[model samples]
Structures are given as structure tokens and as C-alpha cells.
Target: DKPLRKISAAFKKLAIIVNSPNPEVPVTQFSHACSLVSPLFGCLGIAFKFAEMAYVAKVDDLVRASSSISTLVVMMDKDIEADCVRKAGSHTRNLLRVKRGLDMVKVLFEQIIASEGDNSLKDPATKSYAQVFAPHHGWAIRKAVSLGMYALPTRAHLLNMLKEDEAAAKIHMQSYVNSSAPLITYLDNLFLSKQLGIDW
Candidate 1:
């Protein structure tokens, strides 16, 4: 119950960051990740943990937080919670685009992950992940799935979910290789493993 609220708040903030002029900025992506992670939220959780964490912060107990953006005020008494009030008349209108993309990502993913059948993905697969291919999976989803599959925790772990059989996982991965994008060299080696750059 409480956790969902946290995620809701994260989603709420993401709605603001996504349409931002530079959506790829750390603050923006950190905002979206806050929403996706449900129980989690923060400046990408740790990246911008500085400033607040830099001497600008502390660990009082089990709680954590940071104020990583904005100009450091020389006069703490001259407080301004947000700078968006520029023009001050239609602040939200200015922030509207940020609102849309988060809604789109969350609402759509909620829909995608909501599927029941045609959801037949086994081992290293779930109906929700399978649903990304619907309506028209062709190449986009294939490439995405490749990245996602590669991103999974481990070959054995993904294989356990994909079908519990290495052969099946290889075959299943191959099916997506229908692309012939010269990614062919990559297909057979899809499950090959090494020290993942980021645990995926």
C-alpha cells in the first residue's frame, strides 16, 4: 500500500521530467526510474546522490534524500522551492509535455504487461514480455527483446524462465533472429556470457 504510493509519486514526477527540454538528462531519466521501480525513488537512486551526499547530506537513520539540482543559495533565507514559476501565470502549461510521456510510458506499459495469453512465452519469458510483440512485432520488438534478453540477470536464470532448456532458449532466441540484420552473427551467440557491464 505505502510502496505503491511511492511509485505513484515517482510516476508523478516522471510525468514532469519526460517532456523536459532535455529528457535524456540524468535528472529526467532518474525520475522515470523512480516510477518503474515501485518501492524506489531518487536521483536515479544514487548517481546524483552527491551534493546532498557530498557534505550537502547525511544518514540520520534508515532514511535517505538529496538536493542535487539548482543553484546553491548563498542566502538560505531567500527561499524558492521551484524555479518553474517563471512567467508564473501558466506554469503547468509549460510543464504539460513532461506530463504526457510519463503517462504514455506507464499507461502503455500497464496495458502491455496486462496481457493474458498469446502470452505464450516460456522459460526466460513471461506473457508480459511476450506482449511487447503484439499488433506488429516485426523488427523493433525483436531488437528490443534482444537487448532485454541480454539484459536479463543470467543465461541460466533467463533459461530457467525461457523454458528450463538451453536448446529451447536458443531456438526461441533464434526465432526472433528472423531479421537478418547481420545481427545474425549475434543470434547464435545471444546466450553467450561474460562479466556483464552492468549485471545485464
Candidate 2:
């Protein structure tokens, strides 16, 4: 509950940054906010080793980039101007990876909130993985995701771990879902406006 509360609160602040007039997502703040959310990937268990590692590392890149880059748009613009947007270790590419990781968790939260009867997390988690991550993943990683899903805790168990009840956890999860939507869209459009499609 503490972790979710902090993450959701960070998402709220980032959402405000995105919605403000003449929006600018500052690299320092954005990276710090992302650092709060990165732990969620670890909760997915070892099968998500690649995902967790990639996301945490990318967030760290963003943190490091903050020393030189002022804002998200500035970071992308520099990369685009230098024609290094697609290059490995570029801030823009790191932003895209971080965005995907955020979206994966957002989708998972949505799926969990939408489910009616089952308390098992497999279906929601699987659906989240397919929607946000599967297309970009190869067969081996996809297979590992499917296999590792068995390690996921049940809804009740997950809430128990969070020291929250079902109702309380759902409220917190919904807060995250509500706050993350615009941040994801803003990040997506940053790429889309540059004609750098998101799927890649």
C-alpha cells in the first residue's frame, strides 16, 4: 500500500506536468517519478528478469541523462537533431523503453480492476503482457513470460503482501490507472509527432 500510494502520487504529479499550459516533463523529476514505479516490475517475479532489468536500467539512464538534458522534449529533440534517436543508449530510446514499461503495468492494473469473479492474476497479467509487451518480444521471452506467469501471486495474496485489503488496494490501483493514462499518451505522442512510430 505504501509503494502503490507513492507511485500513484508520483503519477498524479507527472500528469499535472503533462497537462499544464506549455507542458514540459523535466528529466530530473520524470526520472525520479519513474524510479518509484520501477519496483512494480520486480513484483512480477523472476520470469520478468529481462523486463525488470531493462526498465530499471532505462530509468537509470534517464536519471543520468537528467544531468545534461533538461526536459523530455529537449532530450528527444537533441537525439533527433543528432540523428541518434534509434541508436542504443540514447535518451529518446530510453524514454520509449521506460514508457513501454509504464504502459505494461498500467494495462495490468486496468485488467485487474476490470476482472469480476476470479481472484487469480494470471489472466489479467497475461492480457497486460500481450497488449503492451508481446508484439515487441521474441518467442523465447514470450515463452518465458507465459511460464513465469505461474509464479504470480493470487489477487488476495498480492494485496496481503501490500498490507492492504481488496477494497483499499483496488482504490489505489485505480488511482494509478487514472493518473498514468495521460503520461503514457504524452510520451507516445512525443515519438509520434516526430514520425517515430511507437511499435518500433
Candidate 3:
């Protein structure tokens, strides 16, 4: 299951999304792409169960709404009209959660690519957690997430799970790293464009 192939391709679409003069993230496309990323969280273990439960569910919600919402702007604007964009269950808030989920994986893949050895995934995973998801988590959640690091597979085993040898994995992983960075940034810019502030 060369999952990275599909995952990378999915993000590549969104990566190029910002190049247009009138850039808009279509809810249908965004939901489909983020859905492909759900498997990676399962591979990451229970620490990411939050993503499985929330991120996937929100994407499913967005997919369901695509018939009417059309784009992220449309979704956010709808919430903004009702003055609930930042509310717990609002589409905008859920989209931010999913964006952070994607960023965590992007950072994890980037860290793995930069790592010196193929010994373990702990270091890269830890660093990714620290850089991407740690700040927003409460003390208890952060501690729980840290402990979950022990559940991760070794570097070699992770590659095996993705059905890739080291050499092949590096290439595919690097492709994801390169492509996903701008996609994450694009999502960030979406919030920023609305003056929604991404610090949340």
C-alpha cells in the first residue's frame, strides 16, 4: 500500500491552489484530500485518535456539505453570518483542527526526511508533536500525547507498514514534505485572509 503516493498527489492539488489569481479551496476537493490522510493517523497510534474522531468526522461533514457549501470561504462565511465560526462545532473551527492535523503529519514527514539515522521514529515524531500540535494542547493532553510516543513503530517498521523500502520511502516522503508545506500554508492563509488569526 504505497499510501504516500496518493497522499502526496492529493496535497499537490491544494499546493498549486494558491497560484491562481482568485484562489479558493473547494470543500469537495479539500475533504477528499484530507480523507486520504486519515490512514496516516491510524499508523501513528492512539495519540492521534483525536484526529480519527474529529478530523475525519469534520471532513466527512464538509464532504456532505459540499453540495451546498462549494468552497471553504462559503462554509466560513456561513458560520460568520451566524457568528459561530470560532465556536466548538463550527465548520471553521473544525477546519482549523483538520489543518493542524495535516500540519502535524507534514512536520512528521519532514522530520523523518531530515533525520540522520533510520533507527527509530521517536525523535522525529517527538519533534513533530512539539513543533506542530503541542502548543495548543492542554497540559494533560500534552502529557498523554508524549506518553503515546512509545506506541510508535520503529523507522524500518513504519516504512514496512507503508510497503516501502528505505530508499523508495525517502523519495515518496520527501515528495510529500515538499508538496504539503505550501498546502498547509495555504490553509493558514485562508484563516488569515478572514482575519481569523491562526494562533488558535
lDDT of each: 0.29, 0.86, 0.82
The candidate scoring highest on lDDT is 2
Relative to the unseen true structure, what is the C-alpha lDDT of residue 11 in candidate 2, on a scale of 0 to 100?
88
**Residue-level lDDT tens digits of model 2 in 122-154:** 988899889988898889999988999989887
Per-residue error for 76 in candidate 1, Å, reads 34
Q: Where does candidate 1 clash, by residue pair? A: 15-98, 19-98, 52-57, 122-162, 123-161, 123-162, 123-163, 124-161, 124-162
Record all residue pairs in model 2 with backbone atoms less than 3 Å apart, i.e. clashing. Answer: none
Q: What is the C-alpha RMSD of each candidate to the true structure, in Å?
A: 18.3, 1.3, 1.6
> What does candidate 3 score on TM?
0.93
Q: Specify the highest-TM-score model's number.
A: 2
- Candidate 1 vs candidate 3: the TM-score winner is 3
- After superposing candidate 2 on the true structure, give the runs of residues whose Cα lies further than 4 Å from its correct spot: none
Task: Write the residue-wise lDDT of candidate 3 on 1-200 in tens digits.
Answer: 47988987877778788656677889999899888888888887876666666578877777787888888888888998899988877788888888888888888988898884867888888898899888888898788878888898888788888888888888877877787777777778878988888987
TM-score versus the correct structure, for each prediction: 0.24, 0.95, 0.93
Give the least accurate 10-residue stretch of model 2, judged by summed lDDT. 44-53
Candidate 2, RMSD to the unseen true structure: 1.3
